[PDB]
Design a binder for this molecule. Structure first.
Ligand SMILES: Nc1nc(NC2CC2)c2ncn([C@H]3C=C[C@@H](CO)C3)c2n1
Ligand SMILES: [Cl-]
Lengths: 99, 275, 9
């Protein structure tokens, strides 16, 4: 069975402009385990992004946390772009600092 | 009130080398070890502070054991290919989770050893730690073989033995984090979506463990069908986040209270929006 | 600590 990833883009701490923080993209509920996750800054791929170790839920679906250091600003806009076998085109979810 | 779990993932990938094997270890909601066969130098590695104190015989032995387990899981991927009459050019996955839950007294409550092939149930050790649940015909072949080999008794020897004993040790070494009350740092936000309505959102941040309840009430009764719940998510620092949202008629906000339950809290919080 | 059990299916 194949399942499509749910996506949540958010920050480790409540965002303050000018204050260092972490940008997170939590992908979950997907199968198989192969997946591609990019964090974007104003449309551009952020080079050094890390992720947690591969693990799965009770229903056997996988989850990973992709993260990177960032200092949020008023101007700067961020997103998470995920591609999986269950997706025809890479899905892009924008960061909302209130979600 | 505590648990230790190991999650093994073996994935075949024809054209991309040997099948990949990943193991992660958790105590409650805290990951403490990892293994990845793809790493430049594959070893069992620490992912929690309180585990790093274990000596070379722990990290060397766990590394040798993971390398051995990886080879066996590769063997098992091949066997499954034969059970299911599948092609060697196909890509498949074995997932196995095993471990023990112990009570507040520190004694075994339940042992686990269950698995999936390609995302679906395969075979599982039952609560009696003596019988199996095979999910399909291919897994009935395995069940047949494991009964002869007295596999359940040996799983049971681990689950009553090393599993509970090491879990008890881990809980003691990391008592300051693993047994600490970390209640959520809560607040309620407000953003009017229109003239008619507005969005109430109840946040719960920085909590451990992940288990939490966020419910909205109107005049004291849950708006279960109206409330939008997001999945509990990792903060990246071993803590978790969650928010419940409900859309309410502007002016009637005060009818709505956000109720928060967590084990790090003295007693359940009741929140309201404030300006 | 993980179990040591090289188990065939
Ligand atoms: N339920 C289950 N399914 C397995 N394989 C099936 C999916 C093909 C499996 N292989 C080994 N074990 C136990 C032996 C020690 C632990 C770690 O390996 C678990 C297993 N338990
Ligand atoms: Cl037989």
């Amino acid at each position: 069975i194949q399942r499509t990833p749910k996506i949540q883009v958010y920050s480790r701490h409540p965002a303050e402009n000018g204050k260092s923080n972490f940008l997170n993209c939590y992908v979950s509920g997907f199968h198989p385990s192969d997946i591609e996750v990019d964090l974007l800054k104003n449309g551009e791929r952020i080079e050094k992004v890390e992720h947690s170790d591969l693990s799965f839920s009770k229903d056997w679906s996988f989850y990973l946390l992709y993260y990177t250091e960032f200092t949020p600003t008023e101007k700067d806009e961020y997103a998470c772009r995920v591609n999986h076998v269950t997706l025809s085109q890479p899905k892009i979810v924008k960061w909302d600092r209130d979600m | 009130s505590h648990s230790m779990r190991y999650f093994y993932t073996a994935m075949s990938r024809p054209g991309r080398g040997e099948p990949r094997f990943i193991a992660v270890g958790y105590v409650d909601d805290t990951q403490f070890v990892r293994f990845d066969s793809d790493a430049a130098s594959p070893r069992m590695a620490p992912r929690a502070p309180w585990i790093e104190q274990e000596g070379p015989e722990y990290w060397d032995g766990e590394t040798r054991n993971m390398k051995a387990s990886a080879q066996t899981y590769r063997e098992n991927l091949r066997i499954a290919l034969r059970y299911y009459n599948q092609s060697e050019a196909g890509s498949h996955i074995i997932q196995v989770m095993y471990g023990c839950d112990v009570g507040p007294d520190g004694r075994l409550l339940r042992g686990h050893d269950q698995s999936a092939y390609d995302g679906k149930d395969y075979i599982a050790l039952n609560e009696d730690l003596s019988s199996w649940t095979a999910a399909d015909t291919a897994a009935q072949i395995t069940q047949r073989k494991w009964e002869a080999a007295r596999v359940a008794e040996q799983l049971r020897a681990y689950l009553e033995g090393l599993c509970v004993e090491w879990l008890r040790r881990y809980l003691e070494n990391g008592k300051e984090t693993l047994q600490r009350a970390d209640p959520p740092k809560t607040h309620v936000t407000h953003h009017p979506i229109s003239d008619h309505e507005a969005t109430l959102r109840c946040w719960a941040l920085g909590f451990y463990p992940a288990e939490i309840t966020l419910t909205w009430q109107r005049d004291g009764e849950d708006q279960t069908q109206d409330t939008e719940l997001v999945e509990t998510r990792p903060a990246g620092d071993r803590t978790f986040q969650k928010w419940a949202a409900v859309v309410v008629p502007s002016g009637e906000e005060q009818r709505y209270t956000c109720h928060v339950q967590h084990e790090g809290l003295p007693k359940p919080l009741t929140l309201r929006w404030e300006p | 600590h993980s179990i040591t059990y090289l188990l065939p299916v």
